[PDB]
Design a protein around this nucleic acid. Structure first.
Lengths: 87, 61, 177, 115
RNA sequence: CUCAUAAAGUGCGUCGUAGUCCGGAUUGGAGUCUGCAACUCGACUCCAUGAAGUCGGAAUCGCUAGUAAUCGUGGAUCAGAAU
């Protein structure tokens, strides 16, 4: 089972500006380094780029995604899928 | 954050000087600040209990 | 009527463009087994009455009650209990009930879909799925208590998934992808 | 009478009777009877053939039965095939611990159970 | 000035004995609120689901009058788990 208590973690360097863009809708894709942060409402609809360690991948946050960390949608390793890699 | 705290910039954008807001000095929270101390409701309490705030004391019943 | 053209006309056509073989094997006669929906559980001593009293209106003759072979196994089964009740026979009858079944009354239910999922996978015995409320041109609208919903099967000796269902969509519609 | 997919509400009011449907409830029970113009204090055995007809066609346009249950199964299958703990929670056939559950865990499980 | 509507009560109408318009567990979906921030650790609202339970094996506990029993309400602690 996961863990939270009552201190959900949201890096302030990826929670304050994300609120800025909320001035009038949303803003084009952003880029954050700390994937430790957790996804929440406000971040919905926006496109945040997580750092896999090599580059920043565009992760379109959705209501269904709310709760999970940004790192969960940013795979570290890279497996080709040696085959027809269909579906 | 570092980008939102553009308040530090004395000269406001196209908006008149009225654009300048507040922002907490410790946490940097614009929600609920206390002009007198310039600190937010969350920092004023933490700073209060620590006793770092002079003259300030917890009200009793 | 519209049942003869199938098997003399529309059996060679469906064996020329995508087959290249002989004239038989695709598709014969042989009886078609019509099963019943498990009567057990539902209720107690009865329902066997509202049975064979509905399966005697759509076709001829009555169902026969038959027990199993007296041989106890690793299951709760006593000696002398009626289980099964199956009766299937043919000759030339199983031909008309593939006309008045899929032409009228459908479309004419109340909320029919149209798109069906891949029933079978590696055989012939297709499958099905119907609901309890059905509107038939051979059943009264107000006088029948307790609606009955029975499946529909078809026995075939095919070898490949394709080269099949290409004869089903030759009369029994619909079937979208 | 029969309305949607397999449902036989008998000897009850038009409202409570329809409440036995997986899809519609009290809120939907009132609105439907008001749109079709049917008395809510009338038993299902007192409803005419014309009233039930207008009741079936309208209540027809809705979501219910298997097709919906498969959507649920698929929803649980998608996060199950992925590396999501929630999906593993649905199985709960996974390790509850901190030692290995794969092997050497009979001290808590007991005699080996069939696969 | 507000929290307030007191509840049971009264008048009228509705429901039939079946696990039921009994009983609400559990679970799915959506949302509100407090809080910097509630995925193991919230409360609450709506929809859907709706289990066990049809009154209980050996012992044992509370009371003599507006009290028992029963019903609802406000308060202290306090941003918020008091049945």
């Amino acid at each position: 089972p996961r863990s939270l208590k009552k201190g959900p973690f949201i890096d302030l360097h990826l929670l304050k500006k994300v609120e800025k863009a909320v001035e009038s809708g949303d803003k084009k894709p952003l880029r954050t380094w700390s994937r430790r942060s957790t996804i929440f409402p406000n971040m919905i609809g926006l496109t945040i780029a997580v750092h896999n360690g090599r580059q920043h991948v565009p992760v379109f946050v959705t209501d269904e995604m709310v709760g999970h960390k940004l790192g969960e949608f940013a795979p570290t390793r890279t497996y080709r899928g040696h085959a027809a890699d269909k579906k | 954050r570092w980008n939102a705290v553009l308040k530090l910039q004395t000269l406001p954008r196209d908006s008149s000087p009225s654009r300048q807001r507040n922002r907490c000095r410790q946490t940097g929270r614009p929600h609920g600040f206390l002009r007198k101390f310039g600190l937010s409701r969350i920092k004023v309490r933490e700073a209060a209990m620590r006793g770092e705030i002079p003259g300030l004391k917890k009200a009793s019943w | 009527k519209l049942h003869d053209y199938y098997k003399d006309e529309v059996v060679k056509k469906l064996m020329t463009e995508f087959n290249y073989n002989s004239v038989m094997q695709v598709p014969r006669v042989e009886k078609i087994t019509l099963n019943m929906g498990v009567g057990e559980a539902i209720a107690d001593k009865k329902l066997l009455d509202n049975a064979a009293a509905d399966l005697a209106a759509i076709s001829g003759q009555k169902p026969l009650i038959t027990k199993a072979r007296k041989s106890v196994a690793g299951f709760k089964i006593r000696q002398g209990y009626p289980i099964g009740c199956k009766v299937t026979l043919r000759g030339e009858r199983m031909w008309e009930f593939f006309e008045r079944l899929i032409t009228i009354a459908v479309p004419r239910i109340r909320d029919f879909r149209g798109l069906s999922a891949k029933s079978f996978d590696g055989r012939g015995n297709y499958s099905m799925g119907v609901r309890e409320q059905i509107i038939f041109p051979e059943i009264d609208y107000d006088k029948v208590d307790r609606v009955r919903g029975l499946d529909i099967t078809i026995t075939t000796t095919a070898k490949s998934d394709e080269e099949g269902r290409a004869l089903l969509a030759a009369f029994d519609f619909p079937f979208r992808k | 009478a029969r309305i949607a997919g397999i449902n036989i509400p008998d000897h009850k009011h038009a409202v409570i009777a329809l409440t036995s449907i997986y899809g519609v409830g009290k809120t939907r029970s009132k609105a439907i009877l008001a749109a079709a113009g049917i008395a809510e204090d009338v038993k299902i055995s007192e409803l005419s053939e014309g009233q039930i007809d207008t009741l079936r066609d309208e209540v027809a346009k809705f979501v219910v039965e298997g097709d919906l249950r498969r959507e649920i199964s698929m929803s649980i299958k998608r996060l199950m095939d992925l590396g999501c703990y929630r999906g593993l929670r649905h199985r709960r056939g996974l390790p509850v611990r901190g030692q290995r559950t794969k092997t050497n865990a009979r001290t808590r499980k007991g005699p080996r159970k069939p696969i």
